[PDB]
Amino acid sequence: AIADSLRSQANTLGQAISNGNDALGILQTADKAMDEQLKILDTIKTKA
Amino acid sequence: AIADSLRSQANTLGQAISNGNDALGILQTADKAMDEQLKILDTIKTKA
């Protein structure tokens, strides 16, 4: 029983790592996207 | 955040330099144009 609980928990954590990596990918994409908007706003202010 | 604020300030100042140079050109043009009016007025007084 203990070994089965530990196996279930180990599999759950091995999947949680992948969930975390997916969240990392999404957030990195979002930030690297925001970078260009920052540069564009800088350009707008310079033109003004 | 600070890096972007300072980049915005650097770009704004770099454009302000060009605005100042344009103002300098305009004022120099106006003054060197007034010079001939001064000489003409001198000539008019001499003829009177």
Residue A12 CA to residue A21 CA, distance in Å, equals 14
Task: Report which of A30, A32, A41 is spatially closest to residue B4, judged by C-alpha positions.
Answer: A41
Q: Token digits for A18? A: 């992948």
A45 contact B CB<8A: yes
Structural biology method used: cryo-EM
Per-residue three-class SS string for chain A? CHHHHHHHHHHHHHHHHHHHHHHHHHHHHHHHHHHHHHHHHHHHHHHC
- The structure tokens listed for B31 are 């003054």
Interchain pair A42, B11: CB under 8 A: yes
Contact list, B4 vs chain A (CB under 8 Å) = 38, 42
- Breaks in chain A (C to N over 2.5 Å), named by the residue before each, are none
Kindly provide the resolution of this structure in angstroms, with one decimal. 3.5
